[PDB]
Design an enzyme around this catalytic site. Structure first.
Site, PDB file in Angstrom:
ATOM      1  CG  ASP B  57      -1.479   1.385   1.201  1.00 27.27           C
ATOM      2  OD1 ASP B  57      -1.760   1.300   0.368  1.00 27.27           O
ATOM      3  OD2 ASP B  57      -2.419   1.535   2.375  1.00 27.27           O
ATOM      4  CD  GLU B 136      34.263  13.218   9.230  1.00 29.32           C
ATOM      5  OE1 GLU B 136      33.913  14.114   9.250  1.00 29.32           O
ATOM      6  OE2 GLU B 136      35.607  12.488   9.179  1.00 29.32           O
ATOM      7  CD  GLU B 138      29.426  14.792  14.696  1.00 29.20           C
ATOM      8  OE1 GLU B 138      29.435  15.205  15.970  1.00 29.20           O
ATOM      9  OE2 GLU B 138      30.730  15.006  14.465  1.00 29.20           O
ATOM     10  CD  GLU B 193      32.709  14.695  16.964  1.00 25.98           C
ATOM     11  OE1 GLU B 193      33.242  15.922  17.758  1.00 25.98           O
ATOM     12  OE2 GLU B 193      33.980  14.756  16.243  1.00 25.98           O
ATOM     13  CD  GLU B 200      32.522  12.236  13.299  1.00 25.75           C
ATOM     14  OE1 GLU B 200      32.838  12.643  14.345  1.00 25.75           O
ATOM     15  OE2 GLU B 200      33.316  11.642  12.385  1.00 25.75           O
ATOM     16  CG  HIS B 249      31.470  16.852   8.591  1.00 18.10           C
ATOM     17  ND1 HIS B 249      32.735  17.489   9.952  1.00 18.10           N
ATOM     18  CD2 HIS B 249      30.300  17.933   9.348  1.00 18.10           C
ATOM     19  CE1 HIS B 249      32.367  18.309  10.480  1.00 18.10           C
ATOM     20  NE2 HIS B 249      31.410  18.398  10.770  1.00 18.10           N
ATOM     21  NE  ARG B 320      37.712  19.167  11.595  1.00 19.95           N
ATOM     22  CZ  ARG B 320      38.923  18.633  11.759  1.00 19.95           C
ATOM     23  NH1 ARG B 320      39.271  19.214  10.964  1.00 19.95           N
ATOM     24  NH2 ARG B 320      38.803  17.871  11.277  1.00 19.95           N
ATOM     25  CD  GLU B 337      34.925  17.788   6.529  1.00 21.07           C
ATOM     26  OE1 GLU B 337      34.701  18.716   6.931  1.00 21.07           O
ATOM     27  OE2 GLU B 337      34.543  16.606   7.152  1.00 21.07           O
ATOM     28  NE  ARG B 339      33.288  21.227   9.167  1.00 24.68           N
ATOM     29  CZ  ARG B 339      33.886  20.610  10.145  1.00 24.68           C
ATOM     30  NH1 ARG B 339      34.439  20.160   9.289  1.00 24.68           N
ATOM     31  NH2 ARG B 339      33.616  21.097  11.503  1.00 24.68           N
TER      32      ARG B 339
END
Ligand SMILES: O=C(O)CCC(=O)C(=O)O
Ligand SMILES: O=C(O)CCC(=O)C(=O)O
Ligand SMILES: O=C(O)CCC(=O)C(=O)O
Ligand SMILES: [Mg+2]
Ligand SMILES: [Mg+2]
Lengths: 447, 447, 446
Positions: B57, B136, B138, B193, B200, B249, B320, B337, B339
């Site tokens: 369904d 990654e 977390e 973390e 993580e 990330h 970062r 990356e 983020r």
């Protein structure tokens, strides 16, 4: 009104403490008590403090002055003398609302009361007018939740105009009305409102200054008397979801040369050109006025676009769906009801922005739109867009940006009030958008 | 990979149940169990259900089809067969991720898995490329609050990379890694973390489809194993204020003709023109990508503008503070990356919008801005405005409006996913803006 | 007159004036006006007593839409009274009003005005006076000691029982004094059949004076019970397996200042007018019960197939039939309509009863023979042969009968008739969709 009259009431009622009251930028009342001594020596000491005023730390008051220039003064308005009823009768406590002044004896720019006096004196000098306001500030009576004492709930499961025992507040409203009558109020009506535990105590209209002084005293009167009956009163615009919010509908009108300028016997709807120009000005700056008249984050949960609220920027006769409603009363009582405000706003700044936007329409002779007699909630968004019925901002930050770009309200409030209000409310908004709410925890902890 | 290989494993390893798994529009996994019978009759029955699929369904699944056209099918992908380890070993329970198909045997337009397959096949046909992703994701391990069992708190007062007993999750992470290795994962590293109770578990990169299948299985694996150890795992982007949020990330890169196209030995930062064109495309549609990669109201409390977060639309090497970070690894491991994402997003739609915006930059050969090697959080708003470092939307509704006006992501997701996602998320946003939050009650009940 | 009210307020020190009225469901609604000291306060009260005051009609149930909410109240000065339960020092007085539109015209959807209209039309056509005397029964409750969330009866007493078996002689003492202060002529006060059930009877009067006293009575019993730490309810059937709250309506019509129902030289000493009126009530009986029994719970007391005034027939001194003709004759000749309960709106209940009865008087309809036998002892096959039909078994069945009935449609008016059916259909829908506790007990095991 005079120094001699105020001192005569002190001897008659046996006043022992004089509260020198005023308001911060957000409309929160602030005061200092002065003890009056016995005999003529105490009477003449009080005379000096009534005429010359007294000093206070301005840095501690919100939106006033910095720590490096904190010395300020309070000049009492002798026409606002009133005996506080909730306080004892023997050795009574009386109040006197003051105007905040700088050390050099000049009115303080960042004073909300002086801001309203300034625009009213300017209006009386330019047009020979008198700005009259009559609000309907609603409130909620609360009691601790029996299942959890940390939370609060409404005092009763009562509806609009309900009778006892369904309405559990006739005794609370009784004492409120007696207290207001002693403070000099002309109470018109009192009753239970739509939402559970919600109530409304109405009072007669008067000039914007006397009305704003009455709104501050009313809020204190409602809260103090509720504590006496073991309850807690709140003027929060929307304390509970799924039920009506507290609204402060502002019935207003201007009288040029001691005559009702809004009335015109020979005109459409018996409304003058001056009335239509004033309404056009309010609707023009509507997106900016709601920043002052609805200054809390919670205000935009009652005044929420897309849902049943006075959010639609339009006017209408005897219709509560639009932002403005023109009551059916005519002659002297011809007026317009701005339904957007809630009792969380500073009355001195709320009446200033309403008079400034309204007078902007009168000065420029702006054309008002046609009245939307139809129910606006039943209309679809595509239909409302064709007619041109815009909506008030959906949140506090959206309204602050509109206020910032508005030059009419910036000039009326002044650089000090305009900038400090935006700065305080942006920090308040930032605290809200960063905090993790209970709604988010309920909706996303499972993911 | 083939029908015979799956049936051969079922015959010898004593598999008793087959979970036909898939995902709804929001990325929530959904499945139906099929019991395998003993002997040749059971194997021939399973062969028919593996080749022809089975019905379900579609109206009950979120963002799929209406009640008047609910009949749908699931065509299994034999390459995703995996034994669920948390289930029993004797009479084991195996899974097979499937593609949602219409009654006429045509791939369903509103299928997130088919949406990612479509754009990957189009990329492989036009450029002969392979889109690789390595996330990654977390998560937080929670325990009931001792002072109140209705609320949850973090499992331990541990920090980044902390050791036992300060880190109370080595046993929980141990079983998670063993379970993922049995499911076919190549686990790279596991640790505690920054925030209390946050962890993580990283895994090797692979093609977007195999990586998105792994993200769904990872989320289920982390939650079920936490329940075995009396805890509750949550992939909420920001369960608690004042501590780090759960971020996913996405390390990504494209390989044209089986070669690392992002690497160029003779170039600035050893990064190719193809890499810079891809980064330019992500930064161009950054305000629209966050609607899909950050689809919850809570996501904008972690990814909050004006505060320390990957909100600044800019790229940088080993920094970062920016939305994109280019890790120092070079050669085959040359990558970027992104983020901004959090584990609350649908991985199939997140990799689709990232590949579509990135390929828009490669096709048009868009010029990327200079890398902001400086810390962007330490910069002032006037300085960031001069450089041209714009910020990602402050809330869910602000991101949905950006996604709605974006034509690149509309085409990649398709009319069915694009319109249903906006409709579901607007109803979710409306529920949030109308609800009275605990923050409002704390701040305004006193007024 | 205006001056009579102002002179009482001046000497007795009255401080609040309640402008009372009722919504479509008979729930009372009011607003308080503070009376100021001196001549200025008396002149302000004079203005609001003659011209009235404004109120939001959209917030009242079954009144007007939001886009047309401006409505007024016109006080009926003859209904002035001092609320006894309120404080004596700075006393509180009330004035029952008629709802009027912005244009100063009587509101079509007003229940009080609806009763005035049919009464004034009756006095203009036949020169009559419609007299009614109800018996609105109630239940005094107390929290269950085994669970505070539920309520049980106050005493384990019975009909006319004496104290301490009857634990409400103190509560009925204050109810009688409170009603006496409001201007009621109380005739009797006693305990009723079921535990915690009580009854307070008052003298009959004209339908309007009676309907004002029914609203004032319902509020008096509840406010006096809450003072003595109890909670009174006019629910038609709060507990299963015991009597329910019934409001018997002893009614009669006096044409030309004489008892028209009495006929010294006739069968049972009952006139032709009485038999024509009874024939009209029995004709519209299936439709009148929609208004006189408007709650879902009403059909648990008034339940067909079980002992109740469900059988559509008349009889002398027999409580088993829907109508009972009391044995009193002369001025006291009347008919007791037993089906009603105190959950109904009195203004609409007397309106539908007078209109159905006058339909029988205008057409001169013939009434059937009286069923002196006990109807509960009869079988369904015997009741079918005699033609003894029963009242509807539920709320929705009664709303269908009211909808088809054109006699009661015109008496209530397009506004009251349509809003009532809309409000009660939505109320019925809420009941039929909810999973009741009976279903949980009977079907969770399956
Ligand atoms: O309840 C009110 O609104 C005012 C006070 C009052 O009417 C009363 O004391 O009964
Ligand atoms: O703690 C981890 O991160 C993985 C498991 C482990 O190393 C252990 O069992 O001690
Ligand atoms: O109980 C009653 O019915 C009226 C009051 C009474 O008789 C009493 O006070 O004892
Ligand atoms: Mg109101
Ligand atoms: Mg069974």
């Amino acid at each position: 009104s005079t120094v001699e009259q105020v001192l005569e009431y002190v001897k008659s009622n046996n006043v022992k403490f004089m509260r020198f009251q005023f308001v911060d930028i957000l409309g929160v009342p602030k005061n200092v008590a002065f003890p009056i001594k016995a005999g003529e020596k105490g009477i003449e000491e009080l005379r000096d403090v009534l005429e010359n005023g007294l000093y206070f730390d301005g840095s501690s008051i919100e939106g006033f002055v910095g720590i490096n220039e904190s010395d300020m003064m309070l000049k009492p308005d002798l026409s606002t003398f009133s005996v506080l009823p909730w306080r004892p009768s023997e050795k009574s406590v009386a109040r006197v609302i003051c105007d905040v002044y700088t050390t050099k004896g000049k009115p303080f720019e960042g004073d909300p009361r002086g801001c309203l006096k300034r625009v009213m004196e300017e209006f009386k000098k330019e047009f020979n007018g008198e700005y009259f306001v009559g609000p309907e500030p609603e409130f909620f009576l609360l009691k601790k939740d029996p299942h959890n004492p940390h939370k609060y709930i409404p005092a009763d499961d009562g509806g609009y105009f309900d009778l006892e025992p369904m309405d559990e507040a006739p005794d609370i409203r009784r004492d409120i009305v007696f207290a207001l009558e002693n403070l000099g109020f002309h109470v018109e009506a009192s009753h239970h409102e739509v939402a559970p535990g919600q109530h409304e105590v109405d009072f007669k209209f008067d000039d914007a200054l006397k009305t704003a002084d009455s709104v501050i005293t009313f809020k204190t009167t409602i809260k103090t008397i509720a504590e006496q009956h073991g309850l807690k009163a709140t003027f929060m615009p929307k304390p509970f979801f799924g039920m009506n919010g507290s609204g402060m509908h502002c019935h207003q009108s201007i009288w040029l040369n001691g005559e009702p300028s809004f009335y015109d016997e020979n005109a459409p709807y018996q409304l003058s050109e001056t009335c239509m120009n004033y309404v056009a000005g309010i609707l023009k700056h509507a997106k900016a006025i709601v920043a002052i008249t609805n200054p809390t984050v919670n205000s935009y949960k009652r005044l929420v676009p897309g849902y049943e609220a006075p959010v639609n920027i339009a006017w209408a006769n005897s219709n509560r769906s639009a932002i403005i409603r023109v009551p059916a009363a005519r002659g002297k009582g011809t007026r317009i009801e701005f339904r957007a405000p809630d009792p969380s706003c500073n009355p001195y700044l709320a009446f200033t922005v309403m008079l400034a936007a309204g007078l902007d329409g009168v000065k420029n002779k702006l054309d008002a739109p046609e009245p939307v007699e139809r129910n606006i909630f039943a209309m679809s968004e595509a239909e409302k867009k064709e007619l041109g019925i815009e909506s008030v901002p959906a949140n506090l930050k959206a309204a602050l940006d509109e206020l910032e770009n508005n030059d009419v309200l910036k000039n009326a409030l002044g650089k000090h009030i305009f900038e400090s209000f935006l700065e305080i409310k942006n920090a308040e908004w930032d605290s809200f958008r960063t905090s993790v709410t209970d709604w988010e925890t309920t909706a996303y902890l499972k993911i």
